Swiss-Prot record, chain A:
Documented effect of changing residue 812 to K: Disrupts the enzyme's active center
Name assigned to this protein: DNA-directed RNA polymerase subunit beta
Organism annotation: Escherichia coli (strain K12)
HAMAP family reported in the protein's UniProt record: RNApol_bact_RpoB (MF_01321)
Superkingdom in the source lineage: Bacteria
PANTHER family: DNA-DIRECTED RNA POLYMERASE I SUBUNIT 2 (PTHR20856)
Curated annotation (Swiss-Prot), chain B:
Coiled coil: none
Localization in the cell: Cytoplasm
Subunit structure: Interacts transiently with the RNA polymerase catalytic core formed by RpoA, RpoB, RpoC and RpoZ (2 alpha, 1 beta, 1 beta' and 1 omega subunit) to form the RNA polymerase holoenzyme that can initiate transcription. Identified in a complex containing RpoD, the RNA polymerase subunits RpoA, RpoB and RpoZ, CRP and DNA. Interacts with Rsd; this prevents interaction with the RNA polymerase catalytic core and with promoter DNA, and as a consequence, promotes transcription from promoters that require alternative sigma factors.
Ranges for region Sigma-70 factor domain-3: 1-65
Role this protein plays: Sigma factors are initiation factors that promote the attachment of RNA polymerase to specific initiation sites and are then released. This sigma factor is the primary sigma factor during exponential growth. Preferentially transcribes genes associated with fast growth, such as ribosomal operons, other protein-synthesis related genes, rRNA- and tRNA-encoding genes and prfB.
Organism: Escherichia coli (strain K12)
Domain text: Contains 4 domains, connected by flexible linkers. In the active conformation, the domains are in an extended conformation, each making extensive interactions with the RNA polymerase catalytic core. In the autoinhibited state, sigma-70 factor domain-1 packs closely together with sigma-70 factor domains-2 and -4, contrary to the extended conformation that is seen when the protein is part of the RNA polymerase holoenzyme.
Superkingdom, taxonomy of origin: Bacteria
Site (Interaction with anti-sigma factors): 93
Record protein name field: RNA polymerase sigma factor RpoD
Family note: Belongs to the sigma-70 factor family. RpoD/SigA subfamily.
Source organism phylogeny: Bacteria, Pseudomonadati, Pseudomonadota, Gammaproteobacteria, Enterobacterales
Curated annotation (Swiss-Prot), chain C:
Protein name per Swiss-Prot or TrEMBL: DNA-directed RNA polymerase subunit beta'
Family membership: Belongs to the RNA polymerase beta' chain family.
Endpoints of the signal sequence: none
Assembly, per entry: The RNAP catalytic core consists of 2 alpha, 1 beta, 1 beta' and 1 omega subunit. When a sigma factor is associated with the core the holoenzyme is formed, which can initiate transcription. The rRNA transcription and antitermination complex (rrnTAC) consists of RNAP, NusA, NusB, NusE (rpsJ), NusG, SubB, ribosomal protein S4, DNA and precursor rRNA; S4 is more flexible than other subunits.
Positions contributing to Mg(2+) binding: 208, 210, 212
Outcome recorded upon mutating residue 496 to E: Resistant to antibiotics salinamide A and B
Task of the protein: DNA-dependent RNA polymerase (RNAP) catalyzes the transcription of DNA into RNA using the four ribonucleoside triphosphates as substrates. Resistance to the antibiotics salinamide A, salinamide B, rifampicin, streptolydigin, CBR703, myxopyronin, and lipiarmycin can result from mutations in this protein.
Effect of residue 531 to R: Resistant to antibiotics salinamide A and B
Biotechnology: Co-administration of salinamide and rifampicin or salinamide and myxopyronin suppresses the emergence of resistance to both antibiotics.
Length: 1341, 96, 552
């Protein structure tokens, strides 16, 4: 049941829940995206196809010439990834596009038979993604983080007053396109409606309607409801719709001419409305007083005269009513202005609206958008059309269109990118509805409204930008010149497209150096989703609201992993099982519950879809492949958690882990930690530095196997077989015949990367863990990465801690460590760094790399080559010369005393400087390799060419295996065909392999096949020859360099870094500390048996910080090492196999109701012995998050190993021998060594280099700068009376030039006096102000 | 030439096409570049600018100033011990 | 200026000046040439615009952008901002003779000392060393002195040890909120690369030893040295200037040690012996013949300050414990015995120091503060106090309280559907119920925890305060509080939705029992809200204090 790397060491886990899904491939979010950008998709519009089909074909102005798109192709990259890194060049592929130019005929309307000229064009470089999800830009590993931005569409928000006595709720609506300008509607505090285009300035909202060729009557038609008054020669009568009367005090009596219904004074009830409704009342003879107050809809002209008696939208008057009666109009269509349930907002906006017709409205918009220009007809027309309705200037991507329609309760999902006028009017409709109280306001933080962009989509966008930039030049050139002579590749300039793409990849805010501290940081960097970046929210713009944890984050983003400080809540990490649907919204899996029975169908549900159902919890007690044990379950629905019956549940969570990210899922006892400390622990695991010897965690969670394998840092078997030869640098493996492909020989080579440098200057090294002759299957580990044990993630090392106060050496978070930890070389790290010496050619002459260097004794020149480069393997310390370089010095006129001195002693004083490269002060290491780059014209030194010779030897060595492994397959096919036309069993085998071609059988097809195979061997030879010549040419040819650079030398230096007081250490539960002292072994507290404790921590850090993970982990670690010691003692008694089998199996099946069943009987004796060997150091345990090992189980495990169940021991003092008065907690905890080393942080400065314009000392350890004495510190000295130290800090220490040199020369003489002056910074200020034409000057006295 | 060959042209091939000697082309390539602004933000965060990063070269070191003063004093002491006419001759000759 | 790579670096004023000159020259050319008027009007406007962009960019509406993308920075920009001359180069500037590194606790130090690494000290005090190498004749010239130092000969270390003696240095930790953030210490040379800081001054600095760093400055002149010694030395700053209370206040381990040493217990070794003063008490305890907690009768001589400052001596036979007798040997003479004769907490120790200050002076309090620290560390270590998981006891009747509250809320919710209860009524009632249940659980837990030890007093049973380690950390005021222990052993309580509303069902589990998925997700809301509050509150605090400092 177990793979071999598992039978090597099975890790016991305590999980009770049975898992349904497997953890998916972790990096998929990256890889999948990029594939869509390159995948050659015929109909599916993704990436390059979509961009080309968007722009091409490009129509010339006259319509006689056009450029046509055919297809594209990605060329083979010229340099491989390793070569790209060593040469500092981008890993990329050439993009080659087939274009077709078509020239029409003037005479015939569209005669396309004049010229069709088709050819390939080179159109820029495209960087490629390595199979691990990273790009190599300029020789460095970069990662592009996904971005989380607000999806296109419509959003109806409210800003409830936020400043008013009224406290009015103000409603606005925004339309956001994918590409285009913004359109915004809103209410004025006086219930008037306003429009903003691109957030410039308000206009009354009806101008948009007028610009759309709508007449005032038509506006009033589409928004409002009409009301009908009949006139009968004296009578004013209204057509009555009963429910229109709701919510109004009675004005008069309303009889339906038969019987009184509403008496004056009666409040109108629902019963009155119902009576009217059943009575079928239609017409009421209303008093003439009533219509005094209403508003007219249509334009009532006098039919006798044709003049406007009253136009639309005027309040009616009694005399106006009379004139309408006399004009012959029986019909009056007034307006339905019924208060709050309906609103008169459109009418009021019309009344404020100044513009009258379409053209004036366009003029208004035009002079709002482009103020100060005359508004001609055509200009306004073109501006409006291009503004909102033109294909190339506005786009609601299919995402935006779907979101739009679904916000408006439409049916269709697909639509045009441009806005139709129905869309605008519907948006206005819904905004008004919200104002009257029908609809609801959207929530902007909902993960149904926020969408993620991955690298494929941003790259595609930038490529489209570049293509559009090409469009201009192509289309103009298509028009002017003669169309006959030119070919398409002359029309296109490659430079702009590659400019856009390479600028995005190299300079964008989302392209970042990859974190190579260890595998976990790598994974968690490839998986972050960032809210910042182009087209996204920024720091200051971000309030408290966007930064919090929303109820829809459940199972989509981690709640407890996000940076502290300013970026909190803006950068956050994708959870474990989450993925994205085709539109780009996060979604998570669920188990479907059929009619009470929990099935195994997985459905992925999005954010908006999830809230509809009722979802159970992950830990609800299921029953024997059936329905729930409990009658009543705990569930969540519509964002609220509550209790439900069995019958009402629809879905169930997949596993307990699916809430948290990866980094948090690696913490052992998460469910006992306060969230503040779990956050810190998650952030701190990513900074661990990988030590010399990897060590598995005795207390894990089981996600380590997945992280280690998926991070891509190990070497994983590709198809499986048997190991044939293992080296420290190579593994070759014969393939099983089952998966051996029928053409080839079955040999796979894995080359291991050894001692290369990471971005953070740590060591990268792979070690083989398989042994010669062992059998392996597909997918199991052959080599260990930097910080991986036998297949598992192992960030740090696990130590004997005691929780007690020492003599104040662990005061506040400090840590006391034993000398054994230093002796054992635990926590020793290896750091690799670059050093570079560049020789240029100056105006006085070229510098040169030589060992003949002035003013240097032979002691220093001891370690240099003949050519002036260091020998490989020489041990150097601070100040030593690594490469000797001298520059041509000018003429130096010295003051008389040097003339006298040289005259006395006869010093020649040659004209050349000493600009050699030397080791930085403090650094001390070994030189592991040297690399030399020469310009094309310069001769090669001796050193460089012996390096080249060594490289040639290596290349010939390597290429021979590649040749032989291929002859072997070809000869396999020859022997598989020659025995089929006559079997010669031992004859061919015993005679030489080679001269089988000089043998021939009956003139059947066998002879023809034998011949045609013989003509394969001849070009396998040419394969070898051309490839060898390619390698010969690559390393002989001169490297291209920056202009003016003659040659470059790089030296790689390896430093072994040991632990010391000042370094920072931490555990997984958020507990930090700096090493405070290193005790001798005698002084450390010791056990009954004499084993001393390795680290001492402080009790006072648990109760207030309140993370109890530490203590439970310590007890469980003590138990695990206890079982390890039983195994070890049993092994030292030199054997007894049945007893090992028995004890190990009872230990494995200890747990209460664990799911892991390990049958040990099936193991053969050798595998049992090997397993015992690996468990000798302790039983590795696995307690998943929220499915933990609970306390009673820990106590049972402690009993099995013969340890105290309370977890505390009698402990003695190593220094006086007296027992400590109380039992103390002892056990094993997994500690980490973080990347904040005291070596990198110590710094001091007496005097050094000073800045240029200001004349103050520089800043930073690199420049040997001084610490800043900021404003606050000045206030501090002001608060004392310390005036003299202040005047020191301000004048003679930084700016006062004469002052500072004088005071140096004083304190050399033992004087200690000030003699201050005037800071240069003030003189600079004074000149700056004078340059403004303002005369500022010092008044004397 | 780039679109014809499908890659960037080496200066030798470019020199062949322009009918000019290699050194002339190299000289033009190095002359071409235009100066860089002192306010370019070199730090990822827009707090530190290239300008703060540049060192002043004109200044001498307090160490060398003290050394020069000591040298002058020592030379004066040694010269004073020499014969009067010899001392004044040496001063007169070297401009000490 | 020429950059090393052959490129050139320039300031923007060069560009702005160039275009002003260009427009001016072309205007002169135009006027000399008798052009039409629209052209000269154009030139005149462009000249005026160029001058405006020179003097203040962007105030004329549209800022002239450089070659890249960004606006050119002009003269007014060089003066104004947070990064103009005034705040960045005149009011505060970078400084010579200074260094920086990680801090670490040194408990053996005296209150006026700090540990300085050898390498930092060698670098900071460079010229002083050159001077005394020349004085003793060990080096003829300054260059010889350089070569002597760079090769680190032994005489260099002897000279350095002679230089730093009596020379104070200034230690700073940013942000410097108040005037106690800079203090002067006397250095002790150590090996290693971390600065060692005295434990008692951490409160003033607000420093904790988990990766912090501090900066070191060197005062040079005689006046600077003297006012570092007189105004700024750490032994001069024991009271705060905001309010009068002391700042040297013993803390976590010191308080735990003194609490454990002073507390008393029933019959344990050595009841009712009679002792000839504290020295016999120590001789008994360290020989294993008596316990720190024995209730014993000891003969004690106090001193008391007379009318005219004389110290009258008074001798008596007191009832105390072994621990208190041993502690009494530290206390300077002049204070009453009643100070030591009760189980000391944090408040008691701080009051002890304050009394010693206002009676005896400064020097006795400095020495006394040190000795308190030393004794507290020693006896805290000898106690061997630790933290296991069995130390967080849970009331035997928690589940009963929870079940009763659940059933009662169930009945109120059932009663709701009869229409007798509106939404507001039900919500308020349920919250009240859960609050009452929380209080009952918490009180039961404290009752079971605080005074739970039953001891035989040579016969029948007796009841005393407990020696549970978490309870010790609670009472002593060392680190814990009541709310934290409530979370560890009671219920975690009620939580609030993102903004205002308080969720209906509380969290019934505690950290010993472990939360489940949903409860953890609920707590994350408040966690992140508080954390973001602090992160974005620091800036407002800083801006306020800057305005206040500038006004007055
Ligand atoms: Mg801290």
């Amino acid at each position: 049941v177990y793979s071999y790397t598992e039978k090597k060491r099975i890790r016991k886990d305590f999980g009770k829940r049975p898992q349904v899904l497997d953890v998916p491939y972790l990096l998929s979010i990256q890889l999948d995206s990029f594939q869509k950008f390159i995948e050659q998709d015929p109909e599916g519009q993704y990436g390059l196809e979509a961009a080309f089909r968007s722009v091409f074909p490009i129509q010339s102005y006259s319509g006689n010439s056009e450029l046509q798109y055919v297809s594209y192709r990605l060329g083979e990259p010229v340099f491989d990834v390793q070569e790209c890194q060593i040469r500092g060049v981008t890993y990329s592929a050439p993009l080659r596009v087939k274009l077709r130019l078509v020239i029409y005929e003037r005479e015939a309307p569209e005669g396309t038979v004049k010229d069709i000229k088709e050819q390939e064009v080179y159109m820029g470089e495209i960087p490629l993604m390595t199979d691990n999800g990273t790009f190599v830009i300029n020789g460095t590993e970069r990662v592009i983080v996904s971005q989380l931005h607000r999806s296109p569409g419509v959003f109806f928000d409210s800003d409830k007053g936020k400043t008013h006595s009224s406290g009015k709720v103000l409603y606005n609506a925004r339309i956001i396109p994918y590409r285009g300008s913004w359109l915004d509607f809103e209410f004025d505090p006086k219930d008037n409606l306003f429009v903003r285009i691109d957030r410039r300035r308000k206009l009354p909202a009806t101008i948009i309607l007028r610009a759309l060729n709508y007449t005032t009557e038509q506006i009033l038609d589409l928004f409002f409801e009409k009301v009908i008054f009949e006139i009968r020669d004296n009578k004013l009568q209204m057509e009555l719709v009963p429910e229109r009367l709701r919510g109004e005090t009675a004005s008069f009596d309303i009889e339906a001419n038969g019987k009184v219904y509403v008496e004056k004074g009666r409040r109108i009830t629902a019963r009155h409305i119902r009576q009217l409704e059943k009575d079928d009342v239609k017409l009421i003879e209303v008093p003439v007083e009533y219509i005094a107050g209403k508003v007219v809809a249509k334009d009532y002209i006098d039919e006798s005269t044709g003049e406007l008696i009253c136009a639309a939208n005027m309040e009616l008057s009694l005399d106006l009513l009379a004139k309408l009666s006399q004009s012959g109009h029986k019909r009056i269509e007034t307006l339905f202005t019924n208060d709050l349930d309906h609103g008169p907002y459109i009418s009021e906006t019309l009344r404020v609206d100044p513009t009258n017709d379409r053209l004036s409205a366009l003029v208004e918009i035009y002079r709002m958008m482009r103020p100060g220009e005359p508004p001609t007809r055509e200009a306004a027309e073109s501006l409006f059309e291009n503004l909102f309705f033109s294909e190339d200037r506005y786009d609601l991507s299919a995402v935006g269109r779907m979101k739009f329609n679904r916000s408006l309760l439409r049916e269709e999902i697909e639509g045009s990118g441009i806005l139709s006028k129905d869309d605008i009017i519907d948006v206005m409709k819904k905004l008004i509805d919200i104002r009257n109280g029908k609809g609801e306001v959207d929530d902007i933080d909902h993960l149904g409204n926020r969408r993620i962009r991955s690298v494929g989509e941003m790259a595609e966008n930038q490529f489209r930008v570049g293509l559009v930039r090409v469009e201009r030049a192509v289309k103009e050139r298509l028009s002017l010149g003669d169309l006959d002579t030119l070919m398409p590749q002359d029309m296109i300039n490659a430079k702009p497209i590659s400019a856009a793409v390479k600028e995005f990849f190299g300079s964008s805010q989302l392209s970042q150096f990859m974190d190579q501290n260890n595998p976990l940081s790598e994974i968690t960097h490839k998986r972050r989703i960032s809210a910042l970046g182009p087209g996204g929210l920024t720091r200051e713009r971000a309030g408290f609201e966007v930064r919090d944890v929303h109820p829809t984050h459940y199972g989509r983003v981690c709640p407890i992993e996000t940076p502290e400080g300013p970026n909190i809540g803006l950068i956050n990490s994708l959870s474990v099982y989450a993925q994205t649907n085709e539109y780009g919204f996060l979604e998570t899996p669920y188990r479907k519950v059929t009619d009470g029975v929990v099935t195994d169908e997985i459905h992925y549900l999005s954010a908006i879809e999830e809230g509809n159902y009722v979802i159970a919890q992950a830990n609800s007690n299921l029953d024997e492949e059936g329905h729930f044990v409990e009658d009543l379950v705990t569930c969540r629905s519509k964002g609220e958690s509550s209790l439900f019956s069995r019958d009402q549940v629809d879905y169930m969570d997949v596993s307990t882990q699916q809430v948290v990210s990866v980094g948090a899922s690696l913490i052992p006892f998460l469910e006992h930690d306060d969230a503040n400390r779990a956050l810190m622990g998650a952030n701190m695991q990513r900074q661990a530095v990988p030590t010399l010897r990897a060590d598995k965690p005795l207390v894990g969670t089981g996600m380590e196997r997945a992280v280690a394998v998926d991070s891509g840092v190990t070497a994983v078997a590709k198809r499986g077989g048997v190991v044939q030869y293992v080296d420290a640098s190579r593994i070759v493996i014969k393939v099983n015949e089952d998966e051996m492909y029928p053409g080839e020989a079955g040999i796979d080579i894995y080359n291991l990367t050894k001692y290369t440098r990471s971005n953070q200057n740590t060591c990268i090294n792979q070690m083989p863990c398989v042994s010669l002759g062992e059998p392996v299957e597909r997918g199991d580990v052959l080599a260990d990465g930097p910080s991986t044990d036998l297949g598992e993630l192992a960030l740090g090392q696990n130590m004997r801690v005691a929780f007690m106060p020492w003599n104040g050496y662990n005061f506040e978070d400090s840590i006391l460590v034993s000398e054994r930890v230093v002796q054992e070389d635990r926590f020793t790290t290896i750091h690799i760094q670059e050093l570079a010496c560049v020789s240029r050619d100056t105006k006085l002459g070229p510098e040169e790399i030589t060992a003949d260097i002035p003013n240097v004794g032979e002691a220093a020149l001891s370690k240099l080559d003949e050519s002036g480069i260091v020998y490989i393997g020489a041990e150097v310390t601070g100040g030593d010369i690594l490469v000797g370089k001298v520059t041509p010095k000018g003429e130096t006129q010295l003051t008389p005393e040097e003339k006298l001195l040289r005259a006395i002693f006869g010093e020649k004083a040659s004209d050349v400087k000493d600009s050699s490269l030397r080791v930085p002060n403090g650094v001390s290491g070994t030189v592991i390799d040297v690399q030399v780059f020469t310009r094309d014209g310069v001769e090669k030194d001796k050193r460089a060419l012996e390096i080249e010779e060594m490289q040639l030897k290596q290349a010939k060595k390597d290429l021979s295996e590649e040749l032989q492994i291929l002859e072997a397959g070809l000869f396999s096919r020859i022997r598989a065909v020659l025995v089929a036309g006559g079997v010669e069993a031992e004859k061919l085998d015993k005679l030489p392999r080679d001269r089988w071609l000089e043998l021939g059988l009956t003139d059947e097809e066998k002879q023809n096949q034998l011949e045609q195979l013989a003509e394969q061997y001849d070009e396998l030879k040419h394969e070898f020859e051309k490839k060898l010549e390619a390698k010969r040419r690559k390393i002989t040819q001169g490297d291209d360099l920056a202009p003016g650079v003659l040659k470059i030398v790089k030296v790689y230096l390896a430093v072994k870094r040991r632990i010391q007081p000042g370094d920072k250490m931490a555990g997984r539960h958020g507990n930090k500390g700096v090493i405070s002292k290193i005790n001798p072994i005698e002084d450390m507290p010791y056990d009954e048996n004499g084993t001393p404790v390795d680290i001492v921590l402080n009790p006072l850090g648990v109760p207030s910080r309140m993370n109890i993970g530490q203590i439970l982990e310590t007890h469980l670690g003590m138990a695990a090492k206890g079982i390890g010691d039983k195994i070890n003692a049993m092994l030292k008694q030199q054997q007894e196999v049945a007893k090992l089998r028995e004890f190990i199996q009872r230990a494995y099946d200890l747990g209460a109701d664990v799911r892991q069943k390990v049958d040990l009987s099936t193991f053969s004796d050798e595998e049992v012995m090997r397993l015992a060997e690996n468990l000798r150091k302790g039983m590795p345990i696995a307690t998943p998050v929220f499915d933990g090992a609970k306390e009673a189980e820990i106590k049972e495990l402690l009993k099995l190993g013969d340890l105290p169940t309370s977890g505390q021991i009698r402990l003695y003092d190593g220094r006086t021998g007296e027992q400590f008065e109380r039992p103390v907690t002892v056990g094993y905890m997994y500690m980490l060594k973080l990347n904040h080393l005291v070596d990198d942080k110590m710094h001091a400065r007496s005097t050094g280099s000073y800045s240029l314009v200001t004349q103050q000392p520089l800043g930073g350890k690199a420049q040997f700068g001084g610490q800043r004495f900021g404003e606050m510190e000045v206030w501090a000295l002001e608060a004392y009376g310390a005036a003299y130290t202040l005047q020191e800090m301000l004048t003679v220490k930084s700016d006062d030039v004469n002052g500072r040199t004088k005071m140096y020369k004083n304190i050399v003489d033992g004087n200690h006096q000030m003699e201050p002056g005037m800071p240069e910074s003030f003189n600079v200020l004074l000149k700056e102000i004078r340059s403004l034409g303002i005369n500022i000057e010092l008044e004397d006295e | 030439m780039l679109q014809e060959m499908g890659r960037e042209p080496t200066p030798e091939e470019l020199a062949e096409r322009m009918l000019m000697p290699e050194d002339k082309i190299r000289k033009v390539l190095k002359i071409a570049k235009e100066p860089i602004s002192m306010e370019t933000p070199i730090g990822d965060d827009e707090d530190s600018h290239l300008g703060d990063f540049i060192e002043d070269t004109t200044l001498e070191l307090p160490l060398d100033s003290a050394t020069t003063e000591s040298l002058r004093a020592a030379t004066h002491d040694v010269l004073a011990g020499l014969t009067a006419r010899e001392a004044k001759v040496l001063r007169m000759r070297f401009g000490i | 200026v020429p950059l090393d790579g052959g490129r050139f670096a320039t300031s923007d004023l060069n560009d702005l000046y160039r275009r002003v000159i260009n427009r001016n020259n072309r205007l002169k050319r135009l006027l000399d040439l008798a052009a039409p008027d629209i052209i000269v009007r154009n030139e005149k406007r462009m000249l005026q615009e160029a001058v405006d962009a020179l003097l203040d960019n962007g105030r004329r509406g549209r800022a002239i952008t450089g070659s890249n993308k960004r606006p050119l920075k002009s003269l007014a920009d060089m003066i104004k901002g947070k990064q103009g001359r005034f705040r960045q180069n005149l009011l505060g500037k970078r400084v010579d003779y200074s260094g920086r590194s990680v801090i670490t606790v040194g408990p053996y130090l005296r209150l006026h000392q700090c540990g300085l690494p050898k390498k930092m000290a060698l670098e900071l005090f460079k010229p002083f060393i050159y001077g005394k190498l020349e004085l003793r004749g060990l080096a003829t010239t300054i260059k010889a002195a350089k070569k002597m130092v760079e090769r680190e000969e032994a005489v260099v270390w002897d000279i350095l040890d002679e230089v730093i003696r009596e020379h104070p240095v200034l230690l700073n930790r940013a942000p410097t909120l108040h005037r106690l953030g800079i203090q002067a210490f006397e250095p002790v040379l150590i090996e290693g690369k971390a600065i060692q800081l005295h434990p008692l001054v951490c409160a003033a600095y607000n420093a904790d030893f988990d990766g912090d760093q501090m900066a070191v400055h060197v005062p040079l002149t005689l006046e600077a040295q003297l006012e570092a010694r007189a105004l700024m030395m750490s032994t001069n700053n024991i009271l705060s200037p905001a309010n009068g209370e002391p700042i040297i206040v013993p803390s976590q381990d010191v308080v735990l040690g003194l609490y454990y040493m002073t507390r008393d217990c029933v019959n344990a070794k050595g009841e009712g012996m009679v002792l000839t003063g504290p020295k016999e008490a120590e001789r008994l305890y360290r020989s294993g013949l008596a316990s720190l907690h024995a209730r014993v009768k000891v003969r004690i001589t106090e001193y008391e300050k007379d009318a005219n400052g004389e110290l009258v001596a008074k001798t008596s036979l007191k009832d105390t414990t072994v621990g208190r007798a041993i502690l009494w040997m530290i206390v300077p003479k002049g204070l009453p015995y009643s100070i030591v004769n009760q189980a000391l907490g944090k408040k008691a120790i701080s009051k002890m120091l304050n009394t010693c200050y206002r009676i005896l002076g400064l020097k006795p309090t400095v020495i006394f503060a040190d000795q308190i620290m030393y004794t507290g560390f020693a006896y805290a270590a000898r106690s061997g106090a630790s933290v296991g998981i069995d130390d967080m006891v849970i009331p035997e009747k928690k589940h009963e309280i929870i079940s009763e509250a659940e059933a009662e809320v169930a009945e109120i919710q059932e009663q709701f559907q009869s229409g007798l209860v509106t939404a507001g009524e039900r919500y308020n009632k349920v919250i009240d119920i859960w609050a009452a249940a929380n209080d009952r659980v918490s009180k039961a837990m404290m009752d079971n925890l605080q005074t739970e030890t039953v001891i035989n007093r040579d016969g029948q049973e007796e009841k005393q305060v407990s020696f549970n380690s978490i309870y010790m950390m609670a009472d002593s005021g060392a680190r814990g509080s009541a709310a934290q222990i409530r979370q560890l052993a009671g219920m975690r309580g009620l939580m609030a939705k993102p903004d205002g509303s308080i969720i209906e069902t509380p969290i019934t589990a505690n950290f010993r029992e472990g939360l489940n998925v949903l409860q953890y997700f609920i707590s994350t809301h408040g966690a992140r809200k508080g954390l973001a509050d602090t992160a974005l509150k620091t800036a407002n605090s800083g801006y306020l204090t800057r305005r206040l400092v500038d006004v007055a």
